[PDB]
Amino acid sequence: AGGQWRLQQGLAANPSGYGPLTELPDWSYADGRPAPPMKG
Amino acid sequence: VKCTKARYLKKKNMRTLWINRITAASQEHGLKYPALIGNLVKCQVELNRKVLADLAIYEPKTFKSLAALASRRRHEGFAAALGDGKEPEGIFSRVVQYH
Amino acid sequence: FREVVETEGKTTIIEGRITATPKESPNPPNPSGQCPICRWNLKHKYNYDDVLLLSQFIRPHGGMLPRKITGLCQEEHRKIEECVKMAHRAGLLPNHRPRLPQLNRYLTRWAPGSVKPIYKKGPRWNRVRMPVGSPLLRDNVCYSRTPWKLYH
Amino acid sequence: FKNKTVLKKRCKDCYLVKRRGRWYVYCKTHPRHKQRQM
Amino acid sequence: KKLIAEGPGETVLVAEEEAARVALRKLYGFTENRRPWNY
Amino acid sequence: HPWEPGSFRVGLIALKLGMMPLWTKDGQKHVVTLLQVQDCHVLKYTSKENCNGKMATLSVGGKTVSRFRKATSILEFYRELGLPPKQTVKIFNITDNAAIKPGTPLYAAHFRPGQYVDVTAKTIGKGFQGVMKRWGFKGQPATHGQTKTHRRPGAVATGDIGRVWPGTKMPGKM
Amino acid sequence: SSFSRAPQQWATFARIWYLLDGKMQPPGKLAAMASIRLQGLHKPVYHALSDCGDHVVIMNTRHIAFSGNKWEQKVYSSHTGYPGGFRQVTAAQLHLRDPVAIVKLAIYGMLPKNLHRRTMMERLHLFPDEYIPEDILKNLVEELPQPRKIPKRLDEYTQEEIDAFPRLWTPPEDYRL
Amino acid sequence: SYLPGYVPKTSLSSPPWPEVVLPDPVEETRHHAEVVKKVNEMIVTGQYGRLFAVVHFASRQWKVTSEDLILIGNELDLACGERIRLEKVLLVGADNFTLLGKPLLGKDLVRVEATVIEKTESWPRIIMRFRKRKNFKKKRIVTTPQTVLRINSIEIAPCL
Amino acid sequence: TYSPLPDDYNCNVELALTSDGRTIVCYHPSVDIPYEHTKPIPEETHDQVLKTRLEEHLEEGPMIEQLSKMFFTTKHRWYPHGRYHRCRKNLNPPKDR
Numbered sequence: 001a002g003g004q005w006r007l008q009q010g011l012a013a014n015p016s017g018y019g020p021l022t023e024l025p026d027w028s029y030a031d032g033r034p035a036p037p038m039k040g
Numbered sequence: 041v042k043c044t045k046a047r048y049l050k051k052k053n054m055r056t057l058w059i060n061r062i063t064a065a066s067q068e069h070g071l072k073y074p075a076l077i078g079n080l081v082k083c084q085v086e087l088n089r090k091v092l093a094d095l096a097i098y099e100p101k102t103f104k105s106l107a108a109l110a111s112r113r114r115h116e117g118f119a120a121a122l123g124d125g126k127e128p129e130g131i132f133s134r135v136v137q138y139h
Numbered sequence: 140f141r142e143v144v145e146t147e148g149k150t151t152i153i154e155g156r157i158t159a160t161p162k163e164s165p166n167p168p169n170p171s172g173q174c175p176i177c178r179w180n181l182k183h184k185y186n187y188d189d190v191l192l193l194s195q196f197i198r199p200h201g202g203m204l205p206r207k208i209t210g211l212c213q214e215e216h217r218k219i220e221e222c223v224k225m226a227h228r229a230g231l232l233p234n235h236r237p238r239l240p241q242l243n244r245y246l247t248r249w250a251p252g253s254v255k256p257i258y259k260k261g262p263r264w265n266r267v268r269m270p271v272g273s274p275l276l277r278d279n280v281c282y283s284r285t286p287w288k289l290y291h
Numbered sequence: 292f293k294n295k296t297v298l299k300k301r302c303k304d305c306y307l308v309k310r311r312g313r314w315y316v317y318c319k320t321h322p323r324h325k326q327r328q329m
Numbered sequence: 330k331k332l333i334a335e336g337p338g339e340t341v342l343v344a345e346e347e348a349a350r351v352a353l354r355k356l357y358g359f360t361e362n363r364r365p366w367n368y
Numbered sequence: 369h370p371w372e373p374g375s376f377r378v379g380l381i382a383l384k385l386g387m388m389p390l391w392t393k394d395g396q397k398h399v400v401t402l403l404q405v406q407d408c409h410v411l412k413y414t415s416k417e418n419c420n421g422k423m424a425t426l427s428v429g430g431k432t433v434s435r436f437r438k439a440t441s442i443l444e445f446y447r448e449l450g451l452p453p454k455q456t457v458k459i460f461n462i463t464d465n466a467a468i469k470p471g472t473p474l475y476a477a478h479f480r481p482g483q484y485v486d487v488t489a490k491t492i493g494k495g496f497q498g499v500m501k502r503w504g505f506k507g508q509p510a511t512h513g514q515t516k517t518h519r520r521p522g523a524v525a526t527g528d529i530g531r532v533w534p535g536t537k538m539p540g541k542m
Numbered sequence: 543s544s545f546s547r548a549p550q551q552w553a554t555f556a557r558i559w560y561l562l563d564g565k566m567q568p569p570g571k572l573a574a575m576a577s578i579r580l581q582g583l584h585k586p587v588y589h590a591l592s593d594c595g596d597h598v599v600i601m602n603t604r605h606i607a608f609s610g611n612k613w614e615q616k617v618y619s620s621h622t623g624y625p626g627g628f629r630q631v632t633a634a635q636l637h638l639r640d641p642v643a644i645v646k647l648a649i650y651g652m653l654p655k656n657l658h659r660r661t662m663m664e665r666l667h668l669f670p671d672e673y674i675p676e677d678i679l680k681n682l683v684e685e686l687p688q689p690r691k692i693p694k695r696l697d698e699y700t701q702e703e704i705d706a707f708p709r710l711w712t713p714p715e716d717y718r719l
Numbered sequence: 720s721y722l723p724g725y726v727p728k729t730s731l732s733s734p735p736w737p738e739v740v741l742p743d744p745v746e747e748t749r750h751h752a753e754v755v756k757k758v759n760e761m762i763v764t765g766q767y768g769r770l771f772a773v774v775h776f777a778s779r780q781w782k783v784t785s786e787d788l789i790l791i792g793n794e795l796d797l798a799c800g801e802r803i804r805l806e807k808v809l810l811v812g813a814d815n816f817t818l819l820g821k822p823l824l825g826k827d828l829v830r831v832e833a834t835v836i837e838k839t840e841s842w843p844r845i846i847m848r849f850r851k852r853k854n855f856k857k858k859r860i861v862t863t864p865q866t867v868l869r870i871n872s873i874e875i876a877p878c879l
Numbered sequence: 880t881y882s883p884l885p886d887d888y889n890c891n892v893e894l895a896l897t898s899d900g901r902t903i904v905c906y907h908p909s910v911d912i913p914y915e916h917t918k919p920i921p922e923e924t925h926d927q928v929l930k931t932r933l934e935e936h937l938e939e940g941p942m943i944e945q946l947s948k949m950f951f952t953t954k955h956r957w958y959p960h961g962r963y964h965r966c967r968k969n970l971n972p973p974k975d976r
């Protein structure tokens with residue numbers, strides 16, 4: 001849904017493609033340490 | 041083979057009953073599923089159908105708030121259809137630019 | 140308008156008398172319009188239910204008025220005559236029941252008695268679908284996205 | 292009486308009308324001119 | 330002219346006793362929507 | 369109340385004794401059945417509202433029989449009514465104006481000559497019988513090599529149908 | 543929430559008695575809404591296995607209207623089962639013989655073809671007239687609105703509406719009418 | 720007297736839906752400010768109770784609270800008993816209010832903490848492929864790894 | 880004054896935005912059920928009448944159709960099943976929460 005809208009706005013048609021919804025890290029240590037990158 | 045082939049059917053059936061629950065909840069709040077999802081996407085909320093259904097079930101107040109948001113976005117879209125430019129864009133129709 | 144009466148022992152008197160002639164409103168919204176629909180912006184924005192203007196183009200018995208006197212387009216005249224047939228068939232005009240010595244119904248193009256029943260409906264690709272409304276009102280503005288479905 | 296797809300007025304007295312869902316042609320002077328629409 | 334609790338029930342007696350239970354929970358602070366336990 | 373147009377009258381039950389002849393003024397013969405009426409009491413009345421039918425209904429009994437070979441509820445009904453048992457209890461549709469009190473005997477004088485009537489009753493039990501004498505089929509001939517096929521029904525239905533139409537005439541209890 | 547387990551489950555999976563008036567409304571639309579509510583799509587806890595249906599009541603089924611000449615050309619057809627038992631009847635004759643059967647068959651077609659169809663159809667209730675038995679007009683909850691609007695008659699249009707609506711043209715005086 | 724575009728009242732002379740008008744943007748900004756102010760003040764006072772939050776994790780969304788379990792169909796490379804902070808959250812909701820992002824919320828506003836409880840191989844799933852009258856029959860067994868977490872606590876920041 | 884939805888049946892809802900406009904907030908206090916939209920609630924000579932003991936038992940068809948009409952369902956589900964299904968039924972099923 002909304003793929004063409006996202007395209008004309010400048011975002012990925014599928015939000016899983018790129019952007020902060022997928023590129024950010026999905027887990028880090030509670031002490032504030034950065035987790036290693038995901039293979040994806 | 042049926043155990044294998046039933047997996048994607050499970051996927052589809054659950055998606056269908058999620059969307060049906062959501063359509064019902066919206067229609068009893070006064071909205072329709074297509075406009076609801078379009079408005080939410082335009083307002084930048086990526087809530088998939090399963091959590092939308094769980095929200096509509098367990099916390100109807102929050103689902104009602106989401107429906108209100110979607111309706112206001114519909115009305116902003118109608119004002120924009122009247123005048124695309126030459127006007128102040130909708131407050132919720134505004135988007136965030138990332139880089 | 141004029142009212143005629145034919146009335147005495149062995150003698151009879153026929154007489155026609157003028158009557159009160161109503162008039163239109165003094166502010167036509169759209170000048171340079173030869174038909175009333177164009178003078179008032181009513182070309183594609185009327186139906187059977189909005190009978191207020193239909194009551195203007197009918198006789199007390201329920202008869203249609205002539206184009207030569209009413210001053211309408213041919214297309215609009217046939218539009219309103221079909222629409223008035225629809226209204227009568229729905230029964231919205233009880234006072235105009237013509238002259239003398241059961242079922243609810245609406246949106247009926249043709250007459251009820253004339254139509255024969257379809258004892259068989261064909262397959263999907265050549266089905267005998269049921270008519271509704273008329274192609275005449277097809278041009279009417281449709282606020283909905285889907286168009287008017289005239290044949291069920 | 293006879294049924295024709297296309298109708299034709301044989302004489303001026305023949306008059307064509309639309310009755311009970313179909314086109315008819317009636318002539319009282321020449322009844323044999325009566326003509327149904329198929 | 331002010332509500333404290335409502336209760337569903339098969340019968341009116343069950344409904345009113347359940348409403349009493351709800352009000353008691355609300356007053357004692359053991360509502361299901363209470364602050365979780367801090368560790 | 370007196371008779372009115374369209375009204376009806378309660379029927380009754382009788383016992384068939386047999387047949388005998390009758391002769392007319394013209395010398396013509398007419399066979400005629402005798403119908404005997406022993407007790408023929410009324411049993412029950414209903415309202416057309418209670419019944420929810422097109423017309424009110426009464427109940428009439430037939431023959432008095434042993435009070436021993438019945439059910440306890442039926443015997444209670446017959447006692448609280450006051451009359452003995454009746455092996456048959458039939459129903460008669462009737463207008464409301466013709467309401468009759470229970471416990472009233474129905475004698476044969478309800479009818480008169482020069483009158484027409486209808487009669488319903490159970491048929492003679494022939495049991496499980498053949499298609500021919502049940503329905504009236506011709507059957508099959510006897511000679512010309514008919515191999516154990518004389519009184520059979522023959523065919524039943526077509527081949528494409530692959531089944532048998534309900535309501536078909538075959539042997540059964542007659 | 544702060545509710546008890548069994549009472550909460552009961553209140554969630556409870557049934558409801560809805561009412562709708564079919565006077566001058568289309569059987570198709572009213573039966574469609576009734577059917578969705580019978581199988582229970584309207585509630586967000588819908589599942590086929592969970593019998594979460596609701597009881598429905600239609601009112602004034604006799605006073606329904608079709609769109610078009612359907613009263614004449616629509617044919618309800620049924621085979622009794624015997625040879626020549628193929629019967630066809632217009633909606634008009636079928637309404638005269640049984641004013642409820644139209645809406646009944648409509649919902650029977652709208653509904654899914656599961657064994658729950660009969661259960662839902664007996665949940666549903668129908669009455670051709672403005673009259674209802676005591677218990678089944680007592681144990682109601684809500685009357686949902688109608689699908690379509692009723693166009694008004696000239697005897698119904700008040701005078702102020704008429705004189706506000708402008709007259710369109712001036713007739714010549716010399717006309718019999 | 721009548722505007723040219725004027726039209727009498729009929730069935731479809733105007734749309735079927737009711738006419739609507741949006742409020743003034745200045746008054747609306749004032750309203751936004753008032754609502755945000757009161758919400759921040761109330762959550763600082765500590766009126767709320769439980770907190771349910773949505774989280775994007777393992778390529779999919781979940782609704783979670785504190786003291787609740789969650790399963791994921793992959794291996795994280797985390798020793799059991801260890802704690803982690805979940806970053807992505809679509810919204811957070813309490814009994815009287817909710818906060819949802821565009822798309823997601825800020826890092827400083829929330830802090831979702833989850834502990835690892837269990838690492839397992841999934842129960843044996845079977846993959847059989849069969850085609851008809853071509854002796855095409857094949858099977859395989861898979862035991863996907865799966866990790867169990869428990870959401871231990873959620874707290875929000877007054878920052879807003 | 881402009882409202883998106885009628886705030887009279889579940890909760891009085893309002894939306895709002897941060898100053899930067901990156902997060903939305905909703906304030907949705909539930910509704911208080913008015914008092915006005917409510918309803919109010921509802922052998923002598925001798926003993927042993929308190930027994931009030933009446934025993935009626937029907938046979939299969941009548942009782943099943945009676946209780947089916949009373950629960951608004953069909954007669955089919957009421958008929959018993961066979962030992963096959965009775966023993967295949969799991970007796971101690973899992974339960975959650």
Ligand SMILES: [Mg+2]
Pocket residue numbers: 506507508509
């Ligand atoms: Mg022979």
Ligand SMILES: [Mg+2]
Pocket residue numbers: 515
């Ligand atoms: Mg041989």
Ligand SMILES: [Mg+2]
Pocket residue numbers: 514515516
């Ligand atoms: Mg032989």
Ligand SMILES: [Zn+2]
Pocket residue numbers: 301302304305317318319320321322324325
């Ligand atoms: Zn001729």
